[PDB]
Amino acid sequence: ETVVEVPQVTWEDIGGLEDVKRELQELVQYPVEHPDKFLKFGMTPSKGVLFYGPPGCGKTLLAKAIANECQANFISIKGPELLTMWFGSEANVREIFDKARQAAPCVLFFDELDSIAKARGGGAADRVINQILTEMDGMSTKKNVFIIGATNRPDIIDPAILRPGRLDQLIYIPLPDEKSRVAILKANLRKSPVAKDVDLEFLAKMTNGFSGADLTEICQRACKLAIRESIESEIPVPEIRRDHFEEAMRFARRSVSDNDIRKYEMFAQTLQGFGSFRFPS
């Protein structure tokens, strides 16, 4: 069944994205720690955020990290489960939201919620989507239940979701930058024994269009090469030599083509005038 537990991954697992870090902090951590400030100005906190961007950029990791910062429970619903509600039996959504309700500080996370529209392609609408919207509107908003939905194809999302009182804050998660890349390497690589002069900074520099998944795959390949060498030795070397990394590098491949990056950037810009508005004074 659903796992409702405080994630252990922290912000340091992705060193970059300080802007969205702060934006998330002020969207979940501020309503919860300082409700007395929110009822001062009569502001109603938002209860929905939509992550969009190219695959393998850390959207799930971002949701887990924000849940960890506020020590809020994390409930994760996957795309296959959404498609099984759709193909089936869509009343399970209500009990999912009830499970979230039981734990007041909950970051409900719908992963690839555009899967229904991907599988359906008649307008953008599915019984599961409408029941999710009904449950979301029904949420009192007094609870600390905060919904996050990650998507790779925001262009096909049903516009009904993008409404006030629902997922309204669209956040763009771009490909990792050099500092974020080295942080993503350090995480997911520190577990393995690495020594010699493996300059993770050099790899961060060289890998430019790579995503988190690509760096994960490259570290995976280096570990596998080390394991193969050690096995051949048995049939020592308790660390991953540089040679392993520089051999695994030439099989490194980028998952997202620059055309997709251009499309995501066009979307982000479309969601972007006055510029310098000043009162008469």
- List the binding residues: 56-61
Give the separation between CA 218 and CA 186, rounded to whole angstroms. 13
Print burial letters for 97-114: b (CB count within 10 Å at least 16), e (below 16).
bebbeebebbbbbbbbbb
Give the separation between CA 55 and CA 246, rounded to whole angstroms. 25
8 binds, among ligand A1AC1, a copy of itself, none (CB under 5 to 8 A by kind): none
Query: Within 13 Å and on the Cβ side, how many CA atoms surround 17?
Result: 29
155 binds, among a copy of itself, ligand A1AC1, none (CB under 5 to 8 A by kind): ligand A1AC1
Give the separation between CA 82 and CA 90, rounded to whole angstroms. 9
Tell me the C-alpha to C-alpha distance, in Å, between residue 23 and each of 51, 93, 118, 233: 12, 28, 29, 51
CB of 111 to a copy of itself, least distance (A): 11
Q: Sketch the per residue contact string, 113 through 132, with a copy of itself: x for CB under 8 A, - otherwise.
A: --x--xxxxxxxx-x--xx-
Give the separation between CA 28 and CA 203, rounded to whole angstroms. 34
Residue 236 makes contact with a copy of itself by CB under 8 A: no
Q: Sketch the per residue contact string, 16 through 55, with a copy of itself: x for CB under 8 A, - otherwise.
A: ----------x---x---x--xx-xxxxx-----------
CB of 100 to ligand A1AC1, least distance (A): 29
Residue 172 makes contact with ligand A1AC1 by CB under 6 A: no
Q: Sketch the per residue contact string, 255 through 274, with ligand A1AC1: x for CB under 6 A, - otherwise.
A: -----x--xx-xx-------
Where do contacts with ligand A1AC1 occur on this chain (CB under 6 A)? 153, 155, 260, 263-264, 266-267
